[PDB]
Amino acid sequence: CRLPPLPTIREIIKLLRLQAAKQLSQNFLLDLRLTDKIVRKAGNLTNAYVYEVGPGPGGITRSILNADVAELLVVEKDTRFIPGLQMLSDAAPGKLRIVHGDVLTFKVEKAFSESLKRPWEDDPPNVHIIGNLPFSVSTPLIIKWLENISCRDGPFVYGRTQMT
Amino acid sequence: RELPCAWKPVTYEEAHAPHYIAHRKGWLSLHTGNLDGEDHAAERTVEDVFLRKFMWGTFPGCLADQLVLKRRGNQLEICAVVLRQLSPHKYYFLVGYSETLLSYFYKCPVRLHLQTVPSKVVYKYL
Amino acid sequence: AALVPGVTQVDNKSGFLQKRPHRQHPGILKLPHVRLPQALANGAQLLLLGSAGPTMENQVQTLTSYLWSRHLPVEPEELQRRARHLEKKAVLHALRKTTYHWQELSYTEGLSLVYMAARLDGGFAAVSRAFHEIRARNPAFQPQTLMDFGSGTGSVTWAAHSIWGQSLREYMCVDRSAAMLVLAEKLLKGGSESGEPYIPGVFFRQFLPVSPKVQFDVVVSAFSLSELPSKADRTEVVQTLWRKTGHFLVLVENGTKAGHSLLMDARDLVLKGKEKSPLDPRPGFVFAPCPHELPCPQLTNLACSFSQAYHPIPFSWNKKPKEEKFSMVILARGSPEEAHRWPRITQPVLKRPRHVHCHLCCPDGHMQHAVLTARRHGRDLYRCARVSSWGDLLPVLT
RNA sequence: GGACCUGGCGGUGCUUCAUAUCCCUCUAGAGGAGCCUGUUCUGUAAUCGAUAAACCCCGAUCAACCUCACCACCUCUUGCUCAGCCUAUAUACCGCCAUCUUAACCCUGAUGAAGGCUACAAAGUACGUUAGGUCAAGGUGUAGCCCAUGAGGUGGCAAGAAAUGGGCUACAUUUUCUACCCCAGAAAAUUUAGCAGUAAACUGAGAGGCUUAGUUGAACAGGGCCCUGAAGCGCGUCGUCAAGUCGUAAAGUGUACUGGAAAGUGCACUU
Ligand SMILES: C[S@@+](CC[C@H](N)C(=O)[O-])C[C@H]1O[C@@H](n2cnc3c(N)ncnc32)[C@H](O)[C@@H]1O
Ligand code: SF4
Ligand SMILES: [Mg+2]
Numbered sequence: 001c002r003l004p005p006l007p008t009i010r011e012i013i014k015l016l017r018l019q020a021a022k023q024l025s026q027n028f029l030l031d032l033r034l035t036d037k038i039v040r041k042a043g044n045l046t047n048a049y050v051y052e053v054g055p056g057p058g059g060i061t062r063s064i065l066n067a068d069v070a071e072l073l074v075v076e077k078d079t080r081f082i083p084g085l086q087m088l089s090d091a092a093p094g095k096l097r098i099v100h101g102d103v104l105t106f107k108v109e110k111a112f113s114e115s116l117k118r119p120w121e122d123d124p125p126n127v128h129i130i131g132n133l134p135f136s137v138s139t140p141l142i143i144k145w146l147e148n149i150s151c152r153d154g155p156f157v158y159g160r161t162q163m164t
Numbered sequence: 165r166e167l168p169c170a171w172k173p174v175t176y177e178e179a180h181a182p183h184y185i186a187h188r189k190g191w192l193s194l195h196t197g198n199l200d201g202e203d204h205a206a207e208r209t210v211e212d213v214f215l216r217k218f219m220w221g222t223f224p225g226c227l228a229d230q231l232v233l234k235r236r237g238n239q240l241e242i243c244a245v246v247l248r249q250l251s252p253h254k255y256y257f258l259v260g261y262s263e264t265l266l267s268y269f270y271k272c273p274v275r276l277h278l279q280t281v282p283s284k285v286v287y288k289y290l
Numbered sequence: 291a292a293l294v295p296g297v298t299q300v301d302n303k304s305g306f307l308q309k310r311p312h313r314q315h316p317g318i319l320k321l322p323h324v325r326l327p328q329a330l331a332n333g334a335q336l337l338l339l340g341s342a343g344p345t346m347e348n349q350v351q352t353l354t355s356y357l358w359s360r361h362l363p364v365e366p367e368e369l370q371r372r373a374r375h376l377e378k379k380a381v382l383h384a385l386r387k388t389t390y391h392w393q394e395l396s397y398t399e400g401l402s403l404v405y406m407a408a409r410l411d412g413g414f415a416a417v418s419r420a421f422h423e424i425r426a427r428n429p430a431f432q433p434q435t436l437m438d439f440g441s442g443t444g445s446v447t448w449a450a451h452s453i454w455g456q457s458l459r460e461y462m463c464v465d466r467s468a469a470m471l472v473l474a475e476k477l478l479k480g481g482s483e484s485g486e487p488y489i490p491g492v493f494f495r496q497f498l499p500v501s502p503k504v505q506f507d508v509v510v511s512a513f514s515l516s517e518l519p520s521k522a523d524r525t526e527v528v529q530t531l532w533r534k535t536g537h538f539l540v541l542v543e544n545g546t547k548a549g550h551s552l553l554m555d556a557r558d559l560v561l562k563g564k565e566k567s568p569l570d571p572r573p574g575f576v577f578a579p580c581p582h583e584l585p586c587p588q589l590t591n592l593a594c595s596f597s598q599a600y601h602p603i604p605f606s607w608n609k610k611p612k613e614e615k616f617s618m619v620i621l622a623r624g625s626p627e628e629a630h631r632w633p634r635i636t637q638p639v640l641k642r643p644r645h646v647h648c649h650l651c652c653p654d655g656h657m658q659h660a661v662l663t664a665r666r667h668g669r670d671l672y673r674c675a676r677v678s679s680w681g682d683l684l685p686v687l688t
Numbered sequence: 689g690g691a692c693c694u695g696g697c698g699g700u701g702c703u704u705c706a707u708a709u710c711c712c713u714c715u716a717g718a719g720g721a722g723c724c725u726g727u728u729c730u731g732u733a734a735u736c737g738a739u740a741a742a743c744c745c746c747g748a749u750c751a752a753c754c755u756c757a758c759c760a761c762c763u764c765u766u767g768c769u770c771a772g773c774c775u776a777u778a779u780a781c782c783g784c785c786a787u788c789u790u791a792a793c794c795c796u797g798a799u800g801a802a803g804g805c806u807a808c809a810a811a812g813u814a815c816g817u818u819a820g821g822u823c824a825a826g827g828u829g830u831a832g833c834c835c836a837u838g839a840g841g842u843g844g845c846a847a848g849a850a851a852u853g854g855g856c857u858a859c860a861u862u863u864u865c866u867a868c869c870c871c872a873g874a875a876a877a878u879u880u881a882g883c884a885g886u887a888a889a890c891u892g893a894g895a896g897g898c899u900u901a902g903u904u905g906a907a908c909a910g911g912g913c914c915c916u917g918a919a920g921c922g923c924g925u926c927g928u929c930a931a932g933u934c935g936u937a938a939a940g941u942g943u944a945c946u947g948g949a950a951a952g953u954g955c956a957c958u959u
């Protein structure tokens with residue numbers, strides 16, 4: 001599976017129109033090797049449905065697609081990265097489903113089919129969440145999702161979905 | 165050696181470059197052929213070539229420097245500069261031999277003017 | 291000796307002789323005069339608008355002559371061998387006289403502009419002829435991926451676009467010179483620092499990727515290996531490129547003894563596989579211009595080059611059409627398609643009354659100087675030779 | 689473990705000016721018409737290809753029923769003369785052009801690595817290279833075919849179309865013709881130079897498109913750079929999974945809390 005090369009920081013500065021390197025207000029993991037490590041630690045993703053948050057440049061996206069996922073739902077807030085993610089989707093047809101919106105309000109409960117819903121007491125329902133978000137957004141997100149587990153709703157309508 | 169590691173006595177005639185021929189050096193051969201109106205320049209050139217080859221093969225390792233070939237009327241003077249390594253008897257033999265061969269080969273009174281030197285007169289080192 | 295009088299006959303497959311004239315015989319690979327895309331020429335002139343005076347003509351001429359007459363770097367063993375003889379017969383001065391002083395060219399901004407102005411059109415023509423070889427002989431090939439080692443101004447990228455733009459989707463351009471990368475980007479963007487690229491999917495890198503996992507459909511190196519400072523660097527680069535080559539490896543150099551020697555070294559290196567257990571086990575053969583894999587019969591004292599006529603970019607000094615003389619070798623993965631491989635005409639064909647001179651590199655590994663005439667060889671083969679030209683294939687069998 | 693030293697970045701940017709070539713400005717001319725050439729497409733079995741080899745007998749010239757070249761059919765044979773071809777090769781040499789390369793001494797630091805300047809002066813002095821072009825004002829060889837790469841005969845071949853590149857002619861009223869050599873009468877967009885006796889216009893002499901001698905004689909003449917020159921300041925002194933057959937170019941120190949933590953806030957300190 002041949003995919004486009006990862007964008008270097010030069011192309012990223014050009015893409016965000018900053019024209020310099022000290023004005024990003026953001027840190028990117030542009031090391032496909034550490035992202036390989038993270039996706040390995042997420043478990044066995046073969047034919048899994050991955051809800052990936054905070055896609056960004058797409059190191060995590062490339063790592064996950066390298067694993068034989070079935071559907072990879074991407075939720076990006078910025079529109080300057082949608083072009084790169086569309087190129088990624090075209091390079092790997094049928095696997096990358098990109099969406100625009102906030103992860104704090106996006107409704108994952110309708111995203112995937114209802115044939116994946118396992119019971120709560122059974123094994124985790126083959127649906128995974130992977131996320132490299134800004135730390136200013138991951139804490140409210142985990143509080144919200146902890147409430148969802150307490151109520152057995154939201155991303156956990158499919159069962160005991162695992163998060164990384 | 166090594167690639168960036170890279171980055172002989174000579175007499176007067178050898179030292180000075182061709183663009184000094186009328187500035188510092190002279191002309192070895194002197195004749196009227198190349199003057200304006202005169203003829204047979206090519207014949208004189210061919211004669212000069214033969215003289216130089218013959219002399220360099222008849223005095224091997226003796227000529228310290230290049231010949232000077234002068235021509236006045238039908239006379240043909242070879243002024244050569246030789247070393248003091250060969251015996252004078254052999255020099256006299258070769259002078260007589262060369263004079264007679266060149267006189268009968270060019271149908272003119274050729275004459276030869278050895279000047280011996282102790283060793284090559286080195287001008288500089290290049 | 292692939293032309294025995296009265297024995298060798300034209301190779302009639304697909305019913306060639308019956309359905310189509312001789313001027314279109316399948317070995318005709320000659321390309322019409324090459325014109326650069328208008329976008330490329332306009333970008334070049336726009337980028338050179340800053341300074342295109344009488345100095346630039348002299349600079350272009352000097353750079354062109356320097357590159358054409360440049361030799362391969364002198365290996366240290368060669369210095370030792372020559373120094374031994376010079377001592378046997380001061381020695382350093384004699385070496386300085388009798389050895390070529392090979393220098394690295396540092397392509398800063400000014401030299402990048404001069405190199406563009408001096409070589410863009412020539413490189414485009416040479417690479418276009420090399421690519422037309424593949425296109426003509428394998429029209430089914432639809433590459434999706436191209437890499438260009440030493441992509442100076444993007445001439446390979448533009449030629450590959452002009453030929454396979456309906457399928458190519460990624461152009462990796464490797465060039466350690468930041469000024470040259472900047473110039474290539476400006477050229478792709480219409481000669482303006484800000485704009486929209488004409489070719490989509492071009493990626494620029496300053497370091498050569500070294501990984502056999504990532505493998506390209508076409509890997510090109512045009513006038514790039516002559517800039518490497520040593521045979522060890524050339525060997526490692528060629529090994530890396532062959533490892534990353536998926537279908538075709540196109541090497542192009544100047545049509546000189548130095549370029550031909552460099553290319554034949556690369557050809558031997560690729561053909562004599564040394565890797566014990568490579569990731570890609572497919573063997574390699576010579577798709578063009580060689581009809582064999584045996585040693586070149588012209589590496590002894592001559593060279594082997596091919597000419598492509600082209601129209602230079604209009605400038606204050608470019609008025610008449612020019613000719614680009616280049617050496618090439620295309621190495622393809624797999625095995626030869628069939629056993630009917632045809633002689634290559636490696637020199638201008640001389641047409642004279644009722645006979646034709648062709649210098650052929652035969653499949654058996656030998657050169658043959660053939661004087662083809664109708665009565666001796668056959669009317670059809672004589673007409674095929676009459677219409678053929680330099681760098682074409684002669685369809686002869688048995 | 690402590691102290692110190694050399695450094696090296698084949699480095700990175702900027703600053704000011706000398707900044708001439710090169711710019712930019714500025715000045716003066718160079719697109720239409722008719723033919724001839726370059727490229728492309730289309731078309732033919734084929735060449736709208738050439739005249740030490742036609743024609744013409746103003747210049748030039750197109751196809752000429754010249755002749756060579758191409759295409760389709762044939763013929764000749766020991767013949768021209770131990771025949772005949774300009775067919776190749778300078779990718780044979782020579783020649784002619786062109787390309788590229790071409791140490792010692794003396795002091796200082798306690799006699800350590802190490803260092804050595806002040807002018808109203810404080811240790812410093814001494815040829816090769818090339819698958820190059822040229823077989824027309826030139827040679828020395830080598831190869832080819834010899835029922836044909838030789839000699840003839842019968843027909844055909846004589847292209848079409850565009851866009852652009854180039855060349856030759858005439859292109860006027862500040863002109864043209866006569867007399868005169870200047871007071872008469874009749875007619876009707878890129879590019880090339882600039883920089884002065886230059887551009888432009890007009891005459892003569894030569895060797896037989898090239899070399900020399902003259903006459904008349906302009907317009908513009910301001911700003912800034914690339915690049916060496918002259919110096920100055922600063923900066924700067926990469927990462928990762930198993931090493932590359934890896935990727936790439938006001939500020940601080942503590943402590944406490946931190947659930948909108950790519951670090952923030954609170955309290956106390958330092959320069
Ligand atoms: C001058 S370009 C040759 C012309 C160019 N290929 C074209 O198509 O016109 C060759 C470039 O290769 C670069 N180069 C040399 N070694 C390299 C390497 N090992 N990796 C990447 N680039 C290299 C040099 O900097 C040089 O600029
Ligand atoms: S085509 Fe023949 S002469 Fe040319 S490089 Fe190949 S083997 Fe050598
Ligand atoms: Mg001829």
Ligand SMILES: [Mg+2]
Pocket residue numbers: 735846
């Ligand atoms: Mg004709």
Ligand SMILES: [Mg+2]
Pocket residue numbers: 643773
């Ligand atoms: Mg003839």
Ligand SMILES: [Mg+2]
Pocket residue numbers: 820
């Ligand atoms: Mg030659």
Ligand SMILES: [Mg+2]
Pocket residue numbers: 946952953
């Ligand atoms: Mg807080």
Ligand SMILES: [Mg+2]
Pocket residue numbers: none
């Ligand atoms: Mg604090």
